[PDB]
Amino acid sequence: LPALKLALEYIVPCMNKHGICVVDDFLGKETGQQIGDEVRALHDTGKFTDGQLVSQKSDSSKDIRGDKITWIEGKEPGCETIGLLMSSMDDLIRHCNGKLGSYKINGRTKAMVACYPGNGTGYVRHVDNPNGDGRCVTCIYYLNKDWDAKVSGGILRIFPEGKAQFADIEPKFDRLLFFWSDRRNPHEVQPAYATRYAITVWYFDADERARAKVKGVRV
Ligand SMILES: O=C(O)CNC(=O)c1nc(Cl)c2ccccc2c1O
Ligand SMILES: [Fe+2]
């Protein structure tokens, strides 16, 4: 699918109606697998953090850690298919622009690659941007070949604002997800019992980000 046709016929309508949009088979199997390989090489070569401190015990070799992260710009050696993913997200957003709510998207973060290590940890209920920091759209790409949540857990559960209620989204290979980053979409990651990778970029609305700057920037 040309990025523009996906954007106009699918992303924009779904985002405006539901605030959440799932695109399956985004990049296809060859590119998805190449991204998988890049992320696994990052993991195998020690490029992730040790993971979010989940249980701090006053004895510390028994601390439990959860999601590990690394920030990727997309031009690093061995990360160029991740770079390519990021470009493809950006092209999708560029084709939506002016049509997602009333936002005008003018920038994004680096990619945050996350690895839930498969030790029963997940991620607590949260809103990505609860305090007006500029981020308007969360974009997540999942990496996980043959993921079965009934065995491996790791479902993303989102609670669209005032609804009875939730949507359960499997972290499926080659699935791309968008959702509004603000309090409209509280969400959580259920415990994962197998290694679970995802790559997230957040897009900034120009007006929100400009006044967030207000609330060394000193001349
Ligand atoms: O991975 C998923 O399906 C959903 N993940 C998250 O919502 C998520 N959100 C945030 Cl804000 C962080 C923030 C830091 C590290 C990992 C995160 C994460 O997995
Ligand atoms: Fe989140």
Q: Domain coordinates of the chain in residue numbers?
A: 1-219
Q: Is 126 left (phi over 0), alpha (psi -120 to 50) or beta?
A: beta
115 CB less than 6 Å from ligand 1? no
**Experimental technique used?**
X-ray
Do 115 and 154 touch, CB atoms closer than 8 A? Answer: no
Whole-number Å distance between alpha carbons of 69 and 57: 22
Q: Is 174 left (phi over 0), alpha (psi -120 to 50) or beta?
A: left
156 CB less than 6 Å from ligand 1? yes
Per the DSSP assignment, residues forming a β-bridge with 180 are 137
Rg (CA), the chain: 17
Angle between helices 29-44 and 80-96 (to 10 degrees): 130
Whole-number Å distance between alpha carbons of 205 and 29: 32
69 CB less than 6 Å from ligand 1? yes
Do 214 and 148 touch, CB atoms closer than 8 A? Answer: no
- Reduce the secondary structure of the chain to three states and give it as a string: CCHHHHHHHHHHHHHHHHCEEEECCCCCHHHHHHHHHHHHHHHHCCCCCCCCEEECCCCCCCCEECCEEEEECCCCCCCHHHHHHHHHHHHHHHHHCCCCCCCCEEEECCEEEEEECCCCCCEEEECCCCCCCCEEEEEEEECECCCCHHHHECCEEECCCCCCCCEEECCECCCEEEEECCCCCCEEECCECCCEEEEEEEEEEHHHHHHHHHCCCCC
Q: Which CATH architecture has domain 1-219?
A: Sandwich (2.60)
Identify residues whose C-beta is under 5 A from ligand 2, the ion: 128
Question: Which ligand neighbours the alpha carbon of 112 most closely?
Answer: 1
Which residues carry a binding-site annotation for Fe cation? Answer: 126, 128, 187
